[PDB]
Structure 1
Amino acid sequence: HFEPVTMEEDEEVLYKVRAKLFRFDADAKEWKERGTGDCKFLKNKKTNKVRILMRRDKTLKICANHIIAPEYTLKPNVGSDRSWVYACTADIAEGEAEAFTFAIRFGSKENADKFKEEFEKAQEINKK
């Protein structure tokens, strides 16, 4: 005998896409980037709630953290065929839940369309 010398694991990934996230500065007539990286749909296996979790590349800091509410509606932006705009009322990416007007952009219209399909398949899971 010789003696020898993130709080995400209880969830499951439904959908993952690369995206850029913006937030509308209402008082400055301007869009402002919040982060770039992987946007993920996370369904809690002990609740079956689906949420949005998005982390910045390299620094891995969270720029989106909110439930895909059935109340939310995805509306196109006037200058893009690969983006969605929607109001969000409780996002906890930077502290306690604040309401945001978000825009999320993708590499192609294909990805943005598939994001819409998965965003609404998630809203029905969050309704049951």
Structure 2
Amino acid sequence: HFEPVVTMEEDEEVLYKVRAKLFRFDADAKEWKERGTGDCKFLKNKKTNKVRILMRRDKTLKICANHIIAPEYTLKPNVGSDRSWVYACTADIAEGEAEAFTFAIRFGSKENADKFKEEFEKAQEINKK
């Protein structure tokens, strides 16, 4: 015998991965502010069957979106874009403690925006159960 030489996403399944840019509306000023650009993922937890949005910035991998795709949310169009959605979120924990935001998420194409909307609604049906 010769002796030999001596993130918290394990519990989830990826339903949808799309590349996107996320914005937060600064209500106090009159402008949108970028919050991050990366892969936006829809993660179904295997214990609770709960779907969430998880989005990380490229390179740094810092979390710029983290919330339940709640049944009450509604994806509205933005006046300036055919490849974006905007919605209210009552509790996002990307920074730390929960906080309300008015988000907008933009994609590479209209088709990616439309597929996102379909997936967002599929995830919403799952979170009603």
- Using the size of structure 1 for normalisation, the TM-score is 0.99
Structure 1 position 47, deviation (Å): 0.3
Aligned to 2:65: 64
Structure 1 position 91, deviation (Å): 0.1
Task: State the Cα deviation string for residues 43-80 of structure 1 (Å, max 9, x = none).
Answer: 00000000000000000000000000000000000000
- List aligned pairs for 1:42-61, cutoff 5 A: 42-61=43-62
Gaps of 5+ in 1: none
In percent, how many aligned pairs have the same letter?
Answer: 100
Aligned to 1:28: 29
Matches of 2:97 and 2:75, distance apart in 1: 24
- List aligned pairs for 1:69-108, cutoff 5 A: 69-108=70-109
SS in 1 for 2:3: coil
Task: State the Cα deviation string for residues 60-106 of structure 1 (Å, max 9, x = none).
Answer: 00000000000000000000000000000000000111000000000
- Give RMSD over aligned pairs: 0.5
Matches of 2:49 and 2:97, distance apart in 1: 22
Structure 1 position 31, deviation (Å): 0.1
Structure 1 position 124, deviation (Å): 0.4
Gaps of 5+ in 2: none
Runs of 4+ in structure 1 displaced over 3 angstroms?
A: none
Matches of 1:52 and 1:71, distance apart in 2: 15
Structure 1 position 121, deviation (Å): 0.2
Q: How many residues align?
A: 128
Matches of 1:43 and 1:118, distance apart in 2: 12
Matches of 2:122 and 2:76, distance apart in 1: 16
